[PDB]
Each structure stands twice: as C-alpha cells, then as structure tokens.
Design an enzyme around this catalytic site. Structure first.
Site, PDB file in Angstrom:
ATOM      1  N   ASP A 180      11.107  74.708  46.972  1.00 34.77           N
ATOM      2  CA  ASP A 180       9.797  74.707  46.994  1.00 34.77           C
ATOM      3  C   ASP A 180       9.183  73.608  47.465  1.00 34.77           C
ATOM      4  OD1 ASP A 180       9.279  77.145  46.653  1.00 34.77           O
ATOM      5  OD2 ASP A 180       9.776  76.578  45.142  1.00 34.77           O
ATOM      6  N   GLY A 191      16.254  75.554  42.891  1.00 29.47           N
ATOM      7  CA  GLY A 191      15.730  77.004  43.276  1.00 29.47           C
ATOM      8  C   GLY A 191      15.137  76.893  44.376  1.00 29.47           C
ATOM      9  N   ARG A 226      16.134  73.757  34.483  1.00 30.48           N
ATOM     10  CA  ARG A 226      15.247  72.587  33.468  1.00 30.48           C
ATOM     11  C   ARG A 226      13.449  73.203  33.351  1.00 30.48           C
ATOM     12  NH1 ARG A 226      14.769  72.094  39.081  1.00 30.48           N
ATOM     13  NH2 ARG A 226      12.786  71.750  40.549  1.00 30.48           N
TER      14      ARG A 226
HETATM   15  C1  LIG Z   1       4.838  80.019  27.962  1.00 30.17           C
HETATM   16  C2  LIG Z   1       4.822  80.780  29.813  1.00 30.17           C
HETATM   17  C3  LIG Z   1       4.800  81.739  29.922  1.00 30.17           C
HETATM   18  C4  LIG Z   1       4.380  82.358  30.978  1.00 30.17           C
HETATM   19  C5  LIG Z   1       4.306  83.430  30.670  1.00 30.17           C
HETATM   20  S1  LIG Z   1       2.445  84.746  31.634  1.00 30.17           S
HETATM   21  O1  LIG Z   1       1.621  83.427  30.422  1.00 30.17           O
HETATM   22  O2  LIG Z   1       2.331  85.419  31.105  1.00 30.17           O
HETATM   23  C6  LIG Z   1       1.990  83.333  33.337  1.00 30.17           C
HETATM   24  C7  LIG Z   1       2.338  84.833  34.473  1.00 30.17           C
HETATM   25  C8  LIG Z   1       2.071  84.954  34.988  1.00 30.17           C
HETATM   26  C9  LIG Z   1       1.398  83.575  35.464  1.00 30.17           C
HETATM   27  C10 LIG Z   1       1.096  82.483  34.627  1.00 30.17           C
HETATM   28  C11 LIG Z   1       1.273  82.879  32.794  1.00 30.17           C
HETATM   29  C12 LIG Z   1       4.758  80.912  32.091  1.00 30.17           C
HETATM   30  C13 LIG Z   1       5.132  80.047  31.969  1.00 30.17           C
HETATM   31  O3  LIG Z   1       5.800  79.209  32.793  1.00 30.17           O
HETATM   32  C14 LIG Z   1       6.124  77.982  32.679  1.00 30.17           C
HETATM   33  C15 LIG Z   1       6.688  77.310  34.139  1.00 30.17           C
HETATM   34  C16 LIG Z   1       6.420  76.748  34.344  1.00 30.17           C
HETATM   35  C17 LIG Z   1       6.816  76.473  35.792  1.00 30.17           C
HETATM   36  C18 LIG Z   1       8.077  77.014  36.772  1.00 30.17           C
HETATM   37  C19 LIG Z   1       8.126  76.113  37.730  1.00 30.17           C
HETATM   38  N1  LIG Z   1       7.053  75.526  38.920  1.00 30.17           N
HETATM   39  C20 LIG Z   1       8.154  74.805  40.296  1.00 30.17           C
HETATM   40  C21 LIG Z   1       7.466  75.846  41.523  1.00 30.17           C
HETATM   41  C22 LIG Z   1       6.437  76.366  40.879  1.00 30.17           C
HETATM   42  C23 LIG Z   1       5.981  76.522  39.611  1.00 30.17           C
HETATM   43  C24 LIG Z   1       4.785  76.725  38.877  1.00 30.17           C
HETATM   44  O4  LIG Z   1       4.356  75.042  39.083  1.00 30.17           O
HETATM   45  C25 LIG Z   1       8.017  78.057  36.229  1.00 30.17           C
HETATM   46  C26 LIG Z   1       7.383  77.955  34.954  1.00 30.17           C
HETATM   47  C27 LIG Z   1       5.339  79.941  30.187  1.00 30.17           C
END
Ligand SMILES: Cc1cc(CS(=O)(=O)c2ccccc2)cc(OCc2ccc(CN3CCC[C@@H]3CO)cc2)c1
EC number: 2.7.1.91
Length: 351
Positions: A75, A107, A185
């Site tokens: 991204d 990814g 990761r």
């Molecule tokens: C403990 C936890 C819980 C949730 C699920 S949640 O809290 O239900 C949720 C759902 C939708 C939007 C926000 C929050 C989501 C979560 O995501 C962590 C995470 C961290 C990084 C990335 C990858 N990055 C890199 C590309 C863009 C994206 C965000 O900057 C994906 C997921 C961590």
C-alpha cells in the site's frame, strides 16, 4: 461513472524489487507479464530504490505518454504515487491518470479491496496477484475517493486507504521489525500489542454524512468543511465525549489486508469514508475476538459497545498521548493534530 483504457495500451510499472520479501520482479515476470502480453498491454518497468523515490519520480514524470500507472508493491507505494501527482502544478489533470494496484507478496489492502469489489473470493498471495492483473487486462475503470489531510505543523498529505492512530498504528510500527513474515507480520504485531494493551489520550470530532451530504461545498483541493486546527471545530460537527481510545481508524476501503475484511457494511459512497473507533474499557479478550472475526467480516455481529462505526465526510483528531505515531496508508509519521476531508470520485483505478 465508469471508463475504459484503450487497446493496445501503454503503462508504466513502478516496482519495488526489495519488496515482496524480495520477489516482486520475479513475480512480475512469472505472473503479470504473460497476461499483459496476451491483453496487448505494453509496459515499461521502473524500479524504486528507497522511500519517496516513487513520489519524486511521479511528481516529475511526463504523464502524457502513459495510459495508466501500475504500482506493484504494498500500500505504501500507491500512497507515494498519489502524493506525487497531487503536489504537481498540473495536479488537477495529473490526478486523472488511471492507476492500478498489483500486490507484490507482502500484502496490499487496496488490492484486496478491489478484488472484493470485483466479486472475487478472498484470496491471498499469487492468486490475489493473478486476479488484480486480470482486472488490469479487463481495462475497466472506477472512480475512488481521496482523503485530503492537514496537520498542526502545516503538513499537507493525501490518503488513498487509511489513517490510523493508537493500537493499529502501533502495530504498523512494531510490524516493520518482522517483514520476513510477510502479511502475518501484522498478526504477530497485534498479539504483541494486545499483550501490552494501552489506551491513548486524545480528542475526536467528525462530520457525519447525514448532516451535510457528500456534495463538495464551494469555498486546491479546497477543503471547505474544514476550519483551521487552531479554531474549535464547527458547531454542526459531532464531538466524541471520550478522552481515551484504544484506536481510531479512518478507512476508505473494505479491507485492511488480504484476510482482514474490516468494513463489511458495503463499499463507500462517493465522498464518504468509514470511521471506526474503539473506546477505552474493552477487554483484551473481546479485542481478540473482534480481530479474529474480521477475517470473514463478522466482527460487527458481536455488537460490542466499545467499537463505534460512523460514515463521515470529515474529521479532526487531536492526540494528547505524548510521542506517538500515525499510519497513513500504512506509512508511519509522527502523530500531531490532524484533520481531513473526503473528496468524491477523485481519481480512477483499474477495478
Ligand atoms: C485488536 C484489533 C482489533 C481489530 C478489529 S475491530 O476492533 O473490530 C476493528 C474493525 C474495523 C476497524 C477498526 C477496528 C483490528 C485490529 O487491527 C490491527 C491491524 C494492524 C495493522 C494492519 C495493517 N495496516 C497496514 C495497511 C493498513 C493497515 C492499517 O494501518 C491491520 C490490522 C486489531
């Protein structure tokens, strides 16, 4: 609105070779090139060497010779491209150059989202690369929203995918140490951060789509819903009363990763983005449940009262949490007060 690339066509492929666990060029030759040859898509490969290289290349590029710009990466590279277009003197016409996102093996949330919108199953790695390449070969274009961002320090930046603060941004930071794991990761980073769960002090305000609608107001680009960060937000916005968050996330698309269906409530309308935030008080165990449920987009079914979702056209976030980070389209920057406005149907993607 829909559009189509000509046939044959000519595209620039910006590719980061030290990326895709170092396999991006190999994957291009094996999986992308044969399909482009068959679809009569001629290309030129330009290799990126470091951070912002793509941004500065696209800023100074002769765009007239290309029918599209193809970015084969994560991204972050697409973030750089769009920011390069937007900082040109001819930005109004440069931002109309069709763009295409091909995932390179580590990814790509935007590519996962585009695969989803096209009706494909939720695939990863080479299967995702194949599907996104077939979308390029089909040549159809769809307009995408763009988030225009302003910070207290005067930084002007554009986001195609997300702005994250708190838990998610911390995971983006931590996960840089584990690039050898590929997209997993982010799962490891999540567990580590969850094990050390903290909240973050700050203030959030937003302008829900219901209040004004998504039409661009007359006063660039001009962000006419925004007032300066040194002034209070306008009286018709919503101010969130919470002073502490686990996370805040502005998201323009359905997916946060190839197996993370974060926003299952439907593709964003023109001029609208998803805003999520998690209020302090939620347990580690519930946060884990929500994370795991996100794979099939079932996390909203828990009706956890700490997870709040709202569709918005603008927002302001004022962190008061000491030294921290934002992740913008996965790219890290130092956190500070920020606000943004969504612009509708602002650029074209192969999709
Ligand atoms: C403990 C936890 C819980 C949730 C699920 S949640 O809290 O239900 C949720 C759902 C939708 C939007 C926000 C929050 C989501 C979560 O995501 C962590 C995470 C961290 C990084 C990335 C990858 N990055 C890199 C590309 C863009 C994206 C965000 O900057 C994906 C997921 C961590």
């Amino acid at each position: 609105p829909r559009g189509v690339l000509p046939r044959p066509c000519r595209v620039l492929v910006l590719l980061n070779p030290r990326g895709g666990k170092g396999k991006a060029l190999q994957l291009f030759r094996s999986h992308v090139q044969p399909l482009l040859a068959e679809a009569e898509i001629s290309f030129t490969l330009m290799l990126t060497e470091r951070r912002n290289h793509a941004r500065e290349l696209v800023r100074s590029e002769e765009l007239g010779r290309w029918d599209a710009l193809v970015v084969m990466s994560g991204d972050g590279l697409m973030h750089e491209v769009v920011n390069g277009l937007m900082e040109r003197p001819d930005w109004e016409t440069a931002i109309q150059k069709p763009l295409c996102s091909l995932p390179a093996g580590s990814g790509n949330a935007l590519a996962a989202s585009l695969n989803h919108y096209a009706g494909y199953e939720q695939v990863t790695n080479e299967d995702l690369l194949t599907n996104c390449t077939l979308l390029l070969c089909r040549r159809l274009l769809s307009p995408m929203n763009l988030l225009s961002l302003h910070t207290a320090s005067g930084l002007r930046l554009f986001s195609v995918l997300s702005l994250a603060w708190g838990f998610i941004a911390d995971v983006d930071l931590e996960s840089e140490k584990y690039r050898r794991l590929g997209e997993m990761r982010f799962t490891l980073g999540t567990f580590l951060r969850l094990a050390a769960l903290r909240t973050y002090r700050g203030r959030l305000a937003y302008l829900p789509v219901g209040r004004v609608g998504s039409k661009t107001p007359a006063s660039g680009p001009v962000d006419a819903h925004l007032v300066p960060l040194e002034e209070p937000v306008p009286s018709h916005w919503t101010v969130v009363p919470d002073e502490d968050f686990v996370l805040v996330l502005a998201l323009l698309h359905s997916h946060l990763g190839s197996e993370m269906f974060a926003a299952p409530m439907g593709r964003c309308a023109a001029g609208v983005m998803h805003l999520f935030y998690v209020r302090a008080g939620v347990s580690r165990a519930m946060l884990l449940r929500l994370f795991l449920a996100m794979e099939k987009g079932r996390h909203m079914e828990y009706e956890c009262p700490y997870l709040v979702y709202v569709p918005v056209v603008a927002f302001r976030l004022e962190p008061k949490d000491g030294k921290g980070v934002f992740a913008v389209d996965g790219e890290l920057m130092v956190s500070e007060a920020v606000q943004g406005q969504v612009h509708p149907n602002y650029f074209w993607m192969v999709s």
